[PDB]
Amino acid sequence: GAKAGKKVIVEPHRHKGVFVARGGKEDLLCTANLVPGESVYGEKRISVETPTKTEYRIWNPFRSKLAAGILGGLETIYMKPGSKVLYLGAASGTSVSHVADIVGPTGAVYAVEFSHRSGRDLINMATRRTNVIPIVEDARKPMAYRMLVPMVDVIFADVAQPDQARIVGINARLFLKQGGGLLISIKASCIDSTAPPEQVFASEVQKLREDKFFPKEQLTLEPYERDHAMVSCVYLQKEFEG
Amino acid sequence: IQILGAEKALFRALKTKHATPKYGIIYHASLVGQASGPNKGKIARQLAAKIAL
Amino acid sequence: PNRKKEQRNPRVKKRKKYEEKQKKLRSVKAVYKGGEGPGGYQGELSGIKTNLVKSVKL
Amino acid sequence: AAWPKAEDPALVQELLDCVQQASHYRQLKKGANETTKSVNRGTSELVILAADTQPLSIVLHIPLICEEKNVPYVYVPSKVALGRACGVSRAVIAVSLTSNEASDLNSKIRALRDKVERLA
Amino acid sequence: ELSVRVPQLPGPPDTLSDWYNIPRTNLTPELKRDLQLLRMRDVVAMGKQFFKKDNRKDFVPEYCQVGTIIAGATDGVSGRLTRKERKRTIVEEVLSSDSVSKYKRKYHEIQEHKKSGRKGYYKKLMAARKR
Amino acid sequence: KPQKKETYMQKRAVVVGREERKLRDLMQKLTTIRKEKIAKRKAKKEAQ
Amino acid sequence: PSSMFFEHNEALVPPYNVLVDTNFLSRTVGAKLPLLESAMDCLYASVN
Amino acid sequence: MSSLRHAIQRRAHKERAQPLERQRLGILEKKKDYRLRARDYKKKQAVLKSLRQKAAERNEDEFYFGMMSRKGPGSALTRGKGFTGTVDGDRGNKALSVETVRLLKTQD
């Protein structure tokens, strides 16, 4: 496989903040480590001694739906370095560390988790990274963290709820800028377990359009997860920033 | 004495017909640190000769 | 005319036609075919291409 | 400690009947380490955890990985009943029953995880 | 409090500001061998593993950085190269691997097919006529 | 015209070692197999 | 798209989603023909 | 048609070889090898006919500015025994000054 000690080279991706480290027989995806010299969940990481403090961390697509979508080929992921990201469904903070490593020190990641022990893991990794704040609250009630979340630019939504579109609709009505980017990860077996997945995805896209989003891209991230889709949409506009 | 300590770059350059290093341990002395430009290498030569004496 | 051992049995022909049309399907779309293996994540084992956008533009 | 606890009125026995059906269909992993490995390999569709366990920290460690991977989990109140339903001749405290692309058990799986998602 | 300033008045960017300052490629001959190997990595795994056909006119990117996989804490018995296999470049790892005899066999088959009828063949025909 | 005398820049060339010659030979063999494979793929695509 | 096996759409299972055009709608009112009842009698399945 | 023919209608006709008493002369050229030979000769004669037209319709007073940075093809008299009609090109070498050769010889 991609064994420890192999030499890889690290080139930039098409997206900002993400890199692709290619070498030998396996090309993998990575992000620049915010706190160098320590892994979060025991991942392989990439050390380069520049002509020390520079380390990159490998982004598992089977573990994180954002890296699955990036390897699927989204047109954009909306999170440049220095952009505020509201993460909904921040279960234990595994992919939230990579989103925080994307947005860098001058950005901010507001990671909302509901369960408490996942909240403990999230508060540990947000003790390590000083740009992710942890919010242990229910994402169905965004009146709880309206003191904490300012108007963010991107929303990531990886909640597996049947009322997912309403949750994202009220969270984006409260905390998203005009023309706000978001990526929602739809799991068809949790939305509607009886209906076919393409019909489930079209119904969820129509519900987002009723909840005032304008959808611009959609990919079924198929070689990494079954019956999952990632829908990219812009809030209250057609272009992303302005 | 000019290139004590820079021996890896020295013998790499001598075996591959590159240009040898100008100084070794002598670079972190006081008197070669005041110069700037090519006068650094000139003062490294002169200082190494006076160190040998 | 001379015909094939595959053509003398109508089930075995429809078995081999399905095996090769399920094979032609993997060369167009992407099948799931199991997630990460027991060994873990050995990298994206066949390339990563950066300038390729494979999303249905709504 | 076990907040998605299953209640009495014909949900525990629906769970254990689906468990026995999947154990006949050979689509079921038994014991805490096998449930953990199945959830971490992502093939799991639902996971049943006993609540009568001597100290409960085992079936407390499994819900963290289940919440991280977002699969449903539910507590049945008897490990002896869970082992009898699986067909083990030992008490089983954790049961994870996986996904396959073609079965008729998956309808029971889907209705069961809809009831479990309503329970949470 | 308030001092006399130091007057410091006397193209393409060196480090990418948006990608956390990847330095520009110091195009050494070893990095050039590594980049040729990366564009020929389909040939290296001889048909056992095919790759995405990315074929630009220049294989050398503008910004690279040669790094090393450190460690996955979950796997450390077989997902770890030993001391006699941690080599310096990527081409040294390819040469230390197996199937170098397989590359030589395929090269000699190509060499026979390309020496098939070119000029030693015509020298032999001319000698057989002159004899 | 192919030069017949040996120039000074050819006389002063460093004799390269053994490991660098092994890497050179490996790179030669890989580039030839790549060129033959590319020509075969292009011939098949032109036939189709 | 997913659920497409070589020009066979596996996404369409009942209840069938049917888009209606103006020509079809004008002619199904002109032919004295009830819209949802005749669509259900054509497909033998629940349409929306 | 194509279904109105048997397999013995479809069966290939083999090619004879050179006789064994005459195999030293090379291969027996058939229509395919003859087509290759004729294609190569017609191509070479087309290039040579275009070169003869270009050498015939040549202005004797033409002046390009590469003529001040190239050596001409000359004649057999001016060049000598080493006269091909090809304009000689540069191999990349250059006459090297004394300071740089002092540097190179100190390195050697």
From Swiss-Prot, chain H:
Name of the protein this chain belongs to: U3 small nucleolar RNA-associated protein 11
Listed Basic and acidic residues bias regions: 15-24
Shown residues within the full chain: 1 to 108 of 270
UniProt subunit comment: Component of the ribosomal small subunit (SSU) processome composed of at least 40 protein subunits and snoRNA U3. Interacts with snoRNA U3.
Similarity comment text for this entry: Belongs to the UTP11 family.
Gene name of the record: UTP11
Location in or out of the cell: Nucleus, Nucleolus
Superkingdom to which the source organism belongs: Eukaryota
Main function: Involved in nucleolar processing of pre-18S ribosomal RNA.
Region of interest (Disordered), residue spans: 1-24
